[PDB]
Design an enzyme around this catalytic site. Sequence first.
Site, PDB file in Angstrom:
ATOM      1  N   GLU B 135       0.876  -1.158   0.000  1.00  0.00           N
ATOM      2  CA  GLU B 135       0.000   0.000   0.000  1.00  0.00           C
ATOM      3  C   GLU B 135       0.921   1.217   0.000  1.00  0.00           C
ATOM      4  O   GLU B 135       1.252   1.785   1.060  1.00  0.00           O
ATOM      5  CB  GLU B 135      -0.940  -0.001   1.212  1.00  0.00           C
ATOM      6  CG  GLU B 135      -2.132   0.946   1.078  1.00  0.00           C
ATOM      7  CD  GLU B 135      -1.751   2.416   1.160  1.00  0.00           C
ATOM      8  OE1 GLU B 135      -1.851   2.983   2.265  1.00  0.00           O
ATOM      9  OE2 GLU B 135      -1.342   3.008   0.126  1.00  0.00           O
ATOM     10  N   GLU B 144       3.562   8.054  -5.100  1.00  0.00           N
ATOM     11  CA  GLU B 144       4.671   7.527  -4.303  1.00  0.00           C
ATOM     12  C   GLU B 144       5.427   6.448  -5.080  1.00  0.00           C
ATOM     13  O   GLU B 144       6.087   5.598  -4.488  1.00  0.00           O
ATOM     14  CB  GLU B 144       4.171   6.982  -2.955  1.00  0.00           C
ATOM     15  CG  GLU B 144       3.347   7.968  -2.133  1.00  0.00           C
ATOM     16  CD  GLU B 144       4.112   9.224  -1.743  1.00  0.00           C
ATOM     17  OE1 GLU B 144       3.507  10.319  -1.762  1.00  0.00           O
ATOM     18  OE2 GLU B 144       5.313   9.130  -1.412  1.00  0.00           O
TER      19      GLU B 144
HETATM   20  N1  LIG Z   1      10.078   1.317  -2.029  1.00  0.00           N
HETATM   21  C1  LIG Z   1       9.937   1.265  -0.684  1.00  0.00           C
HETATM   22  N2  LIG Z   1      10.671   0.422   0.090  1.00  0.00           N
HETATM   23  C2  LIG Z   1      10.522   0.377   1.430  1.00  0.00           C
HETATM   24  N3  LIG Z   1       9.651   1.154   2.105  1.00  0.00           N
HETATM   25  C3  LIG Z   1       8.853   2.044   1.445  1.00  0.00           C
HETATM   26  C4  LIG Z   1       8.963   2.152  -0.015  1.00  0.00           C
HETATM   27  N4  LIG Z   1       8.082   3.087  -0.410  1.00  0.00           N
HETATM   28  C5  LIG Z   1       7.449   3.546   0.702  1.00  0.00           C
HETATM   29  N5  LIG Z   1       7.935   2.944   1.809  1.00  0.00           N
HETATM   30  C6  LIG Z   1       7.457   3.097   3.201  1.00  0.00           C
HETATM   31  O1  LIG Z   1       6.177   2.442   3.113  1.00  0.00           O
HETATM   32  C7  LIG Z   1       5.216   3.003   4.005  1.00  0.00           C
HETATM   33  C8  LIG Z   1       3.922   3.334   3.251  1.00  0.00           C
HETATM   34  S1  LIG Z   1       2.595   3.736   4.350  1.00  0.00           S
HETATM   35  C9  LIG Z   1       2.620   2.333   5.405  1.00  0.00           C
HETATM   36  C10 LIG Z   1       1.681   1.262   4.856  1.00  0.00           C
HETATM   37  C11 LIG Z   1       1.424   0.212   5.933  1.00  0.00           C
HETATM   38  N6  LIG Z   1       1.921  -1.122   5.493  1.00  0.00           N
HETATM   39  C12 LIG Z   1      -0.051   0.142   6.134  1.00  0.00           C
HETATM   40  O2  LIG Z   1      -0.772  -0.304   5.245  1.00  0.00           O
HETATM   41  O3  LIG Z   1      -0.591   0.553   7.153  1.00  0.00           O
HETATM   42  C13 LIG Z   1       5.888   4.221   4.616  1.00  0.00           C
HETATM   43  O4  LIG Z   1       6.200   3.882   5.979  1.00  0.00           O
HETATM   44  C14 LIG Z   1       7.143   4.462   3.777  1.00  0.00           C
HETATM   45  O5  LIG Z   1       8.248   4.886   4.582  1.00  0.00           O
END
Ligand SMILES: Nc1ncnc2c1ncn2[C@@H]1O[C@H](CSCC[C@H](N)C(=O)O)[C@@H](O)[C@H]1O
Lengths: 337, 337
Positions: B135, B144
């Site tokens: 997500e 993103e």
């Molecule tokens: N390519 C990537 N690799 C690792 N982490 C990532 C990423 N892109 C975004 N993130 C991290 O992914 C998160 C997205 S929001 C967190 C989603 C959480 N799994 C949920 O559904 O509640 C953020 O904490 C951000 O720091």
Amino acid sequence: RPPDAFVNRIDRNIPVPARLRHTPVSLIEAVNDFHYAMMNDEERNNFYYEVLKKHVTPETGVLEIGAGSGLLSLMAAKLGAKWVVAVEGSEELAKLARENIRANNMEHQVKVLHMMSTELKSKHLPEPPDVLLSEIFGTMMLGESALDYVVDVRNRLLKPTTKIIPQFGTQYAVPIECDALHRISSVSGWRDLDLKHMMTLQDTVSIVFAKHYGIRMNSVNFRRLSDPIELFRVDFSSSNRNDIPRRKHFDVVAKESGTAHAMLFYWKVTDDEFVMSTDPEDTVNNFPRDMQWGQALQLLDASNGPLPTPVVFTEGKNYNFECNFSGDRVILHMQLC
Amino acid sequence: RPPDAFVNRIDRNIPVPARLRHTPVSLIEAVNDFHYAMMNDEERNNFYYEVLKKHVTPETGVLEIGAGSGLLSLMAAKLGAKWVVAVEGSEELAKLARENIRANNMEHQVKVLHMMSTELKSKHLPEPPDVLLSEIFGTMMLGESALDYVVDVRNRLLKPTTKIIPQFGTQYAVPIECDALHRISSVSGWRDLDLKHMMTLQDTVSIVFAKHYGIRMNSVNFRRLSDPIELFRVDFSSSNRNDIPRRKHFDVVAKESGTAHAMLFYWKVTDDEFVMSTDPEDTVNNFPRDMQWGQALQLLDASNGPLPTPVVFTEGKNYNFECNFSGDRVILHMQLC
Ligand SMILES: Nc1ncnc2c1ncn2[C@@H]1O[C@H](CSCC[C@H](N)C(=O)O)[C@@H](O)[C@H]1O
Ligand SMILES: Nc1ncnc2c1ncn2[C@@H]1O[C@H](CSCC[C@H](N)C(=O)O)[C@@H](O)[C@H]1O
């Protein structure tokens, strides 16, 4: 070509019209983020017009702190001021003010100086002004240091008979229950999954603008749990920092039972019979005001435990709050004792 | 003591509880600004739970891109996954995820790796996963870089039978009339004072989140002037950047007469029968979703003159728009032709 031309940071496959291309990004951001909304606050504009009208004559010299678009200075000129000088700290906003002055054929009447008011000296003006004018209020009333800037000018450049517009300002706080706010500032769990550890991080310290949350107070259900708390009042013609204590205590009587999720902050500025208020009650039909100033919020923790503790009000009981201020009186914090 | 401890930038006269004092400010900001709202989007959580439930067995290895709080990884573990590995680029969010995993006694089942997914290698996992979960959607669907990050993992770490959750995403645009938005993004004048020069600066280029304006679309009057425009659709199991043209044209038929102040952008993500939509129509009763994703807006200029020209629709007429994309397909712009 400015080093910060708007076109620079835009992708080369995305079109940018000539009117924007070589304009500094900072100016486009200021106008789009703040100035359109300000200029559409019709009650704000009317407040300044009506107060200026009480004072401006062909014999009145007017000094404005913070030209911006130049609108309020243009009002003073429209009202027939002897002369108008406006200072503006932003070089690009100063230029923009001058453009608006040119557009209204008032270059002979309104001068814009690119400088902060702190750098303004008596030699920059024809004479000490009869009227000092400013609209440098923040979401928190003193958020843009209105008192400090007015005090500095008041100490140095005015005369005994100078009218300071606007004269009065009062900062309020009120404890509120707001489920919508609660649902974006807390968590307990999801089904059988415990997420309470997330609450260790709840920010019950910062003052946060309702806008920052994405919330407009007038568009969500909230309940005021007591009468308004007057945090402080200032008279811009006489007050100084030390008229506001660094620490104050307030006895707040609950008029309603509920959870005080947050303290809501709003203010009221007055001059004679005229009022400029950011109380949501007063802005239901003023969307531009709610967008430009809106209101501020501080989440409340009842205690200092490993997790935040809700502040719960029972109708008819007394609640003591300690209000702490920064030295410049711009930042404050309300804590249940 | 971290160099960026929360207590550092707080005024020394303002109290800060122990639970916040020595926590990095970046983490407090991320959780308060984003994570509470995410975790309270019950429909988002239910979407992931229901889709995971279709696929997760005691034999299923699960990889998550972006641990965050750890909620979705915890769901996969709850559903009885063989193993779960979640990558998280933020060191502090990785620690927080681990704390939530500990709180739910799942340390034996869920491992959090502090790294970007681009740095993840086959040796970091027990075996190629049966399920890839993410997500990482923005207010703009690809905001993103969801496609880029999924593609990178898909190219390197998966197996032919790996299920990618969620499978589908579609980005929409719709021209809207919205007087409230207009009143905070334009100006003409004040009484006899001409302020039209201010319009030279109107930003009809940037995509701006409704939240940034302070607006919630579901809380203001707006009118959709045509059927939705599908800008592009992706299948996360097969699409690449070049499945989205760098430039597309759209014929938009006006269903209503009015002024198209802006293009409104929203999206829909699906997997089998389950749907996660940011269309305001679908979020009237989902305040947390409107706060966490909301919708995006681009102001429209009909032409490239010295001043912006309103885009005016007449019911029954055709309007051609050119959509230009950045190379990564994250940034786009709609221009009337
Ligand atoms: N390519 C990537 N690799 C690792 N982490 C990532 C990423 N892109 C975004 N993130 C991290 O992914 C998160 C997205 S929001 C967190 C989603 C959480 N799994 C949920 O559904 O509640 C953020 O904490 C951000 O720091
Ligand atoms: N102390 C100071 N000296 C000079 N300019 C200031 C200042 N404090 C704030 N400003 C400027 O003052 C403006 C405040 S907003 C503009 C107000 C404008 N006169 C109007 O009523 O429409 C901003 O443009 C800001 O850059």
